[PDB]
Amino acid sequence: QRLAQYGISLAEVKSALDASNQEAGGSSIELAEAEYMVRASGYLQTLDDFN
């Protein structure tokens, strides 16, 4: 009923679910003396994140 109310399909739900449980950072910048690795969060940890 709530899927029809807001007008959303199951494919969209699956795509948004499988695209929010990752963690990837692929850079490294030099602060004039040493390297600094760039990391980005995104994992699903608690129920507040699923919601």
Binding site: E30, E33, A34, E35
Partner: protein, 50 residues
């Protein structure tokens, strides 16, 4: 004499290998993690020239 021979036995340590030398050497310094890519080349050139 067989008894007197007990003096050096306890005065000599036990070692697994001798150090066998080769005609070459390998220099390896203990360092720290943080390092860039240009400073590494600079340090390498300095150590080689020294």
């Amino acid at each position: 004499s067989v008894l007197t021979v007990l003096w050096p036995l306890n005065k000599v340590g036990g070692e697994f290998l001798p150090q066998i030398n080769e005609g070459d050497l390998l220099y390896m310094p203990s360092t720290l993690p943080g390092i860039s890519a240009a400073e590494a080349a600079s340090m390498l050139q300095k150590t080689d020239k020294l």
